[PDB]
């Protein structure tokens, strides 16, 4: 006499989508942000396109950890190139970069997904409502790149490889580890990438309309947001979108975002880790020496209630580690999610990072090996309530 | 039975009482990431802040300090936050700051000096030809601040205290140690701050004209002519460089001017109490978010040291200079140890010098020990010594 959650997946992608490729931040200074993030997250300096490379238009530095690719880009003076261009990223434009950065501060310009063919992905998107940002451009007859608007001044970037490198894109030089111990805190890939918009409805119509991504449902049972999740056919590309819920006691954090960010844009990046305990131990140590800071931890009560909730999946010693590191735990139909959120990455209370680990949903593919289903454990919607619960209990125990 | 003498003039012709270098303000796109990077790279503690979390709706400003050295990183918030000020720095302007950063990239906006009275300093300066930037403003009846143009978009900022704080300026909250045992690599104060301009003559005329700073002589191509302006006591030192055109190798000064979009501050020399300690600390962090250093001199350079400075430095101290790539020069009065970083941000503009001065220890009216300003000069000899050592190293391949 149990309960059951049932999921639909129409597999309606209008073109073949593979995986998240990279995230591009537009910065004022690529070098300082890239250096800070490298130390904070344990990402390796892996490729570059700048003056030391021939590029007189923009400085672009790629950091990597597993399959996660973070690109930091900033403009040089236009005066350098006031005389075929030395830029490696065809979309890049001085005007656009400066305007974006003045308007929004440090933030994500481009969410990039690898696809079978960027030309067709772009053609199909425009046909089905997508606003063009940058057209399909082939690079050294090796890579095609196109951009459509996602929300705000964020673009969805399509990347397609002509056939079966660590140089990322044409025009980039590989950087070799200048170290006997290169950095690695266990971050492996991008899990989801969440936008904030003024109204969820139109936003969803737009994106899903041109992509054919479907709604991934969350097991449910005050937070100031209303959200839905767009998902690719295999549910490995996940694009949540939030809107503000007006009226509530505490002002919507989404509404604050929209004010400080001067509009819609990317709110957070959930980075998947092979082991959140390792990652957080590393990141927390670096919090006060140039790394990232974390949101205030749950009360003790939260951790007393974990065995009740996840004592089947997590051992006692793992629950103590969760408490020591301020880790939230949620569970859905299919599996269990460990998560934590940083404080903002730059000056404004806009963009932040989530570290997650997914437990469960191991299944066999056609090769005979295992994979983990995308969205295993959900996105931690349970935790808002589980956190308000634990605070009120903590009070009543005081 | 035959020696040489270098004779220094000092007209002590300052037009107002100057005390010391007070702080340096960098204008950024993102103050947090630059401040975090610098803190880790240079070993400077987070001391104070003025931002949203303190009530500041106009600008985010973060103070790092190491001994008497004070670095301030400032960036603009959206105008819309403060359309209805909470600003701690009265001179700050959204448009000016955006415009600076768009034009010059990461750079020093303000060279700040403590004077006895900022109001009179501004008055006497403007009367003697200075172009005013911000008029004298008194803050919480406690501190007075005024600004005049130094060169390009760099301002000389005057700071005077009413009479007889660790909160730097009114409106700034002190930051306590998040972790006991703050970051400290041995940097103790600013030694000098150097500007690049297109023409030395007009620039010196202007500055000396309104300060009454005298010329400080350098005891005895490199693509530059240099002149040093100095306060009465020679503890405030302000070198200025111009390019020497037609030289074989293009002038590094001329490069600066092209990449920076004009005149601006080229380098900051930071005094260390133990340059060996400082550089071991800084070097271990180079590849993990810190700063990179210029290419070391050839082994020849270190072999020539005992002849040049064997009386001041021991054999083991010379091997240490060789381990760390440290340059050594001498003048009339004493000995200098120096090393230069690679650019601090994207552009080949501003960099940092780390110095230790050895010698000219003297006593004052109180009888307290002081070291004279400029002990050992500024390393002008090292241009030749570098060229020599490279010629010698190349000749001995044989
Ligand atoms: C759709 C979708 N995709 N991911 C989600 N949910 C989250 O990321 C999420 C879960 C839980 C929490 C918390 F429990 F900590 F309140 N979140 C928060 C907390 S927060 O203070 O606002 C943020 C500004 C740190 N933000 N996102 C989430 O929804
Ligand atoms: C006055 C005054 N204030 N500072 C100075 N001079 C220097 O700092 C200086 C001395 C020596 C050398 C070197 F030996 F390495 F060539 N410098 C350099 C070398 S560099 O590759 O151009 C720079 C771009 C690192 N830059 N400034 C100096 O003079
Ligand atoms: Co999330
Ligand atoms: Co110098």
Tab-separated table of C-alpha atoms in Angstrom, chain B residues 297 300-313 318 326-331 334-336 338 379-386 388-389:
chain	number	residue	atom	x	y	z
B	297	UNK	CA	68.794	35.996	-14.973
B	300	UNK	CA	76.449	34.194	-14.939
B	301	UNK	CA	74.620	36.995	-13.103
B	302	UNK	CA	74.926	35.166	-9.771
B	303	UNK	CA	78.625	34.421	-10.336
B	304	UNK	CA	79.280	38.153	-10.775
B	305	UNK	CA	77.523	38.976	-7.468
B	306	UNK	CA	80.460	38.366	-5.091
B	307	UNK	CA	82.602	40.887	-7.013
B	308	UNK	CA	79.742	43.419	-7.004
B	309	UNK	CA	78.177	42.900	-3.543
B	310	UNK	CA	80.290	40.208	-1.804
B	311	UNK	CA	80.849	42.596	1.123
B	312	UNK	CA	77.108	43.057	1.765
B	313	UNK	CA	75.759	39.580	0.924
B	318	UNK	CA	73.828	34.879	-3.141
B	326	UNK	CA	66.355	37.867	-7.262
B	327	UNK	CA	68.276	40.801	-8.754
B	328	UNK	CA	70.827	42.764	-6.741
B	329	UNK	CA	72.054	46.325	-7.328
B	330	UNK	CA	74.113	48.887	-5.447
B	331	UNK	CA	74.442	52.657	-5.304
B	334	UNK	CA	73.487	50.954	-0.003
B	335	UNK	CA	72.220	47.756	-1.645
B	336	UNK	CA	68.876	46.717	-3.144
B	338	UNK	CA	64.422	43.276	-6.263
B	379	UNK	CA	68.076	48.901	-9.944
B	380	UNK	CA	69.015	50.990	-13.024
B	381	UNK	CA	72.349	49.146	-13.095
B	382	UNK	CA	70.536	45.809	-13.486
B	383	UNK	CA	69.668	46.642	-17.117
B	384	UNK	CA	73.384	46.511	-17.954
B	385	UNK	CA	74.262	43.686	-15.529
B	386	UNK	CA	71.511	41.568	-17.148
B	388	UNK	CA	76.372	41.597	-19.534
B	389	UNK	CA	75.516	38.297	-17.855
